[PDB]
Every structure is written in C-alpha cells, then in structure tokens.
Design a protein around this ligand. Sequence first.
Ligand SMILES: CCCSc1ccc(S(N)(=O)=O)cc1
Ligand SMILES: CCCSc1ccc(S(N)(=O)=O)cc1
Ligand SMILES: [Zn+2]
Ligand SMILES: [Zn+2]
Lengths: 261, 261
Amino acid sequence: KWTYFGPDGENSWSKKYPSCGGLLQSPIDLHSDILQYDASLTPLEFQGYNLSANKQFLLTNNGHSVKLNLPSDMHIQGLQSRYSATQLHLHWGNPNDPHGSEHTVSGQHFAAELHIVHYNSDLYPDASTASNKSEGLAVLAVLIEMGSFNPSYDKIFSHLQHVKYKGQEAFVPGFNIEELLPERTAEYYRYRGSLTTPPCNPTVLWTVFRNPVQISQEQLLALETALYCTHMDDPSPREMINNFRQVQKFDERLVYTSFSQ
Amino acid sequence: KWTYFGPDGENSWSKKYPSCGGLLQSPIDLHSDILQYDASLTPLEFQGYNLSANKQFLLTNNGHSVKLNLPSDMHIQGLQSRYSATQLHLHWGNPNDPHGSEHTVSGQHFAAELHIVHYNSDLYPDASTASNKSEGLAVLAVLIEMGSFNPSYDKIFSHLQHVKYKGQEAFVPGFNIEELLPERTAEYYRYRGSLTTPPCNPTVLWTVFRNPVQISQEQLLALETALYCTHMDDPSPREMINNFRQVQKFDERLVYTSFSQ
Ligand SMILES: CCCSc1ccc(S(N)(=O)=O)cc1
Ligand SMILES: CCCSc1ccc(S(N)(=O)=O)cc1
Ligand SMILES: [Zn+2]
Ligand SMILES: [Zn+2]
C-alpha cells in the first residue's frame, strides 16, 4: 500500500496520496540559516501525561512503526487551542546505519525520533476528523541518541517482543509520558508542516525539542531489530528498519526557535 | 513539465517517470557508515579533455540546467569500457541560499555541482541509447564551494546571458575541461546509481571526486540569476534555481572509496 523501500517507497507516495507532493512537507533540516528566535514561543504544559498505572494502553505494530494509543484527557496547554493526545510512535534506522531520525540538525540525523501526536480537540471531535483540517494536529518530536540506559523508554521497549509482526497488539500499564521528554523542554524549534507519512496532510504544528534524550546501545539495537513490517505468517518477512522519510525542500521559510543562545 | 518546485516537483516525478520511484536512485549523502575503501579503484585518465580554443561547442539551456555538448573523442580511460563524453551541466541553489549541490558529504551541501556525462561508446553508438542499459553511463561529479574566482568555470559562465531561456543555444570556444576538475582526482567515491532527473534511469556509474573546487560568490550569483526554465516568450516565467534533487535512501548500497583515510 505504502512502504519506505522498493516500488512503494517515498518517491511513489504522491500517486495515491497527493498531499505527499504538495506544500508544507516534513520533515526538514533544521539549520542555522533558517532559524529565527521568536520570544512569543513560551513553554508548553504537558497535562494528563502521568497516565494512571491502573489503566492499560494499547501498543500496536501497524506495519510502519510501533504505536502506543494515548487517552484524550492527556493534552498540551500553551497553544491557541487545546491539543489532546492520540498516539505516540517512533522512527529509526538500522544497525549498519543507526541514524534514522526524521528531522536533522545542521544536516545530521540523530539515531531515532519519538513523535507524540495530538489533535485540536477544541475545534474537532477526534484525531481522524482533525487530521485533514486547518490547525488540526500538533506533534511533539524528541530526538534520540545513544548514551545511557533509559528506564522510561524501556517502559515501551520491554513490550516490543509482543508486537513483533504487523497487526499484533499488547497492553502497556500507564506511566508518566513526560519522562520521555528531554531536558529543558522550554527550548524548541517550531514550524508549520505535515504528517511525515501518508496521507502527508499539511496540517501539523511541529515542536521539535532542542535537546535529545539518550537510550543505551542495547535499547537502540532492540528497537532496530525487534519488529517486522510483515504479518506473522507472511512467507517473505521484512524487518522494520529505516522507517523515516527523507528531508524535504524548505525554501523562503523560517523555523522559529524559543531559544536564541 | 517536471520541475524542482511545486506540484510537478520531485515527489511527483514518479507519477510520469516510474524509474524515479525505483531502486538505485541518486544523489546520496556520502557519510562514514556507508563508505568502504576499495584498493581496486585505480586512477582515471582524462583523454581529449583539452578541447581546441579554435573550435566551438554548443551551450544550451535545456529547461532544467545549462549544458555544454562535448565531443565523442573526449573520453575516460580506466573503466572497464571506454566511456566517451556527451555533455556537462550544473546544479545550484539560489541567490539567498547558495547551497545547491546534489550529493552531500556528512549531511552538508556544497554550493553547486558539475556533472560531466559519459556513455559506453564501446557498446553503444550514442548516449541516449546507452542511457537505458546497465552501466551505460558514467558521470563525473565535482563538488563546488564558494571561494576564489575560477577563470576556467568562467569560460562557461561568461556565456550565461546568451542562453537565458529554454531552448536557446550559444557557442563556447574550446578550453581544457580538465581545468574544471579538483586536486587529486585519484581520490574519489564510486557507486552505482541513476540519473538525478527524469527519467531517473538506474544506469549510472557515479564518480564523485573527494575534493571540491571553488568559484566565487559573484560567479554563483551569475549562475543563480541568469537562467529561466521557460521560453523567452512565456507569460509565466520561472527562474532556474534550486535545480537539485534531495538525497535518496541507500537501498543497502555501499559507496566505495579510492582513499582509505
Ligand atoms: C491523526 C493522524 C494519524 S496518521 C499519522 C501519520 C504520521 C504522523 S507523524 N510521523 O507524527 O507525522 C502522525 C500521525
Ligand atoms: C544521456 C542521458 C541524458 S539525460 C541526463 C539526465 C540527468 C543526468 S545527471 N544529473 O548527470 O544524473 C545526466 C543526463
Ligand atoms: Zn512520526
Ligand atoms: Zn546532473
């Protein structure tokens, strides 16, 4: 239907998803020439991130990433409208080239990238309806690099073996999703862009935190090697690797920063 | 009517040119994880590059770049067949952002890039026929950085006001094409890839020289302001700027280097 490789990879998405060839596409390279400090960019507030340890949240392998469903009482405060959470998921490379973030900074990929997807619940009833509408979506992006073991990311990664194949689903006990955010969340890049996968709707307000998080080499290896993008009984299995989009052209536009220094 | 910007830009080329969505696409980012030294990459020799100043060669704006036609007696010695020259041309950015190379190195763009296109003349009678056969083409790529004025490049650039519009033709006296190549041509990157424009045929043996050449800011500004993709009489003119493709996924390819450090 769509993939990140072969005949149905990214250069072919615009045949069935015309917005993939339209305006405002993400991701982009965040580089100094196009950065502009904007003192209007104040800190976001993450509300309802501390998920009940008494509730369970659905983890799925959807054949393109691993996604955790989030509840709509979790939201971002600080934007014009409230944006309520719908899901999180990740993008990564492969062990021979372990640099699979979607955004780059001064031309450099990070190892991986987490996206916490929210929709404008003041204007729209659910994420599906908001997804192709004005001001519809807001995604937070965390850049990931190898470093220290990260116990919070392991609250997700410990479940990967239960969602190895496309279609499979596991339950994850609530935990504080703010633990997956980096230091100094007040420091971020902000621009108007798009979903980085089909349908590529140009309806995303991006917030990419300035500082990366760390995960260990073993945790990064697990994320790169645990999943397949095929069904369990597919006689031709494919490993889920390199599930990021290449950077798009971004011309005569700025990315605004909440930091100058 | 494919372009580098807008609805007919590069995410849409695969709608009309299926090889643009196929394998083995160029350009690519040259970075350490995918480099491997190959001691079998011996030096090329450039034969018949010193074109007579008393002869003249056709310069044409083809709607996508500016190209200089080259004579078939100009050839590369050192591949497994003789490859004869057919044309050279360039890719570049724009006046406010002079960063328009096609290949990148460790995620950074150079100002511009020169391609000297050759075809297997042992097997094929012309470059068009060669272009759709396996390793039918060999392209040399020179990375261009903003630096000193370069009198040799100016033997092309001094004619740009005479090929401003699509289809226009000018004559350039012969000069020594080897003066467009960088220092230490024995140091290069080699990989199997494709044309970087439609029809994106995967039939190119690429050689990217390790070292860049320099042209001045004034020479880049001339190149970036002289030319149009449209005909002289077109009521909707379009500036020929940013005529480079984004880098492509490396579909399990390595890039081989003739230098080990
Ligand atoms: C509400 C849209 C659901 S589909 C979807 C597709 C891609 C993204 S991304 N990678 O965060 O831009 C997020 C969501
Ligand atoms: C012989 C093929 C002529 S068309 C052509 C199209 C693209 C290239 S490129 N930019 O050198 O890959 C070179 C030639
Ligand atoms: Zn994503
Ligand atoms: Zn070219």
